[PDB]
């Protein structure tokens, strides 16, 4: 399913009495971060965070920089307005977060657009899947809904998600060819950990995989094992790949009767692993 996505994540945080809100943006293609912007930088500008976006010329970077500087001001106004809708004091710090982008299929056409917001960590307002209407979380957000409706904001948004987002993504997939189209299958191995007694932990590792989506199960004959398993959150290795492990205690005298099953895009076939001393 050579399907793909682009997302921008915005965070604006107010700082009353210490000037304007901070505005931070990051952009992703799939699970690869490719740009950032931070308004607190000495010279705020969009910057490259993946090797394949550096090939864009200086006009690309300046245009995006202008967009984010304008967005920062927009989000400041929004933060001022929201403080008022919730009757909140002027001294406190608050957070407006935005997320938007597009999902496309192997043909490169829009499958789903997104554009939604959270205020102080909770859903505020979201553009619905029809890209023509909104869902408001509470009566404060209905105030914003009425402004967004009045101004037909959903039309400009739709224009972006249908008419710009998908075309830029196509372009980034061409710039990044190899790194974005190729999945990196996990390097895998099981270790033995004796809870120095009459039972031990087997921990099944998966290292160096991209994209992040992976499934690690322990299971008997098609039938699951979880008397006690610890399964850690997938975590970034820091070189654009990810890591994960799952663990289980079995009656380890010699109950190496339990197996580890790994599924991942970069694996032609699901794999099955076992301890090897």
């Amino acid at each position: 399913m050579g399907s793909h996505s682009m997302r921008y994540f915005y965070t604006s945080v107010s700082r009353p009495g210490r000037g304007e809100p901070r505005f931070i943006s990051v952009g992703y293609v799939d699970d690869t971060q490719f740009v950032r912007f931070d308004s607190d930088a000495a010279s705020p500008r969009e910057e490259p965070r993946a090797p394949w976006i550096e090939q864009e010329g200086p006009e690309y970077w300046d245009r995006n920089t202008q967009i984010y500087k304008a967005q920062a001001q927009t989000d400041r106004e929004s933060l001022r307005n929201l403080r008022g809708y919730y009757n909140q004091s002027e001294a406190g710090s608050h957070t407006l977060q935005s997320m938007y982008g597009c999902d496309v299929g192997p043909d490169g056409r829009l499958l789903r657009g997104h554009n939604q917001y959270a205020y102080d960590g909770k859903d505020y307002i979201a553009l619905n899947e029809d890209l023509r209407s909104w869902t408001a979380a509470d009566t404060a957000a209905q105030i914003s809904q009425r402004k967004l409706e009045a101004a037909r904001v959903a039309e400009q948004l739709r224009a972006y998600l249908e008419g710009e987002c998908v075309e830029w993504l196509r372009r980034y997939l061409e710039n990044g060819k190899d790194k974005l189209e190729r999945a990196d299958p996990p390097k895998t191995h099981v270790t033995h950990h004796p809870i120095s007694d009459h039972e031990a932990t087997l921990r099944c590792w998966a290292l160096g995989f991209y994209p992040a989506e992976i499934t690690l199960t322990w299971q008997r004959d098609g039938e699951d094992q979880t008397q006690d398993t610890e399964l850690v959150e997938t975590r970034p290795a820091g070189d654009r790949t990810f890591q994960k492990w799952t663990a289980v205690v079995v009656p380890s005298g010699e109950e190496q009767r339990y197996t580890c099953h790994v599924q991942h895009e970069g694996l032609p076939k699901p794999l099955t692993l076992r301890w090897e001393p």
């Binding site: 952009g27 245009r63 967009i67 001001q73 989000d75 904001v153 710009e164």
Partner: peptide, 9 residues
């Protein structure tokens, strides 16, 4: 490329 800003909330 990011979208140009919308009207404020």
């Amino acid at each position: 490329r990011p979208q140009v800003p919308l009207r404020p909330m």
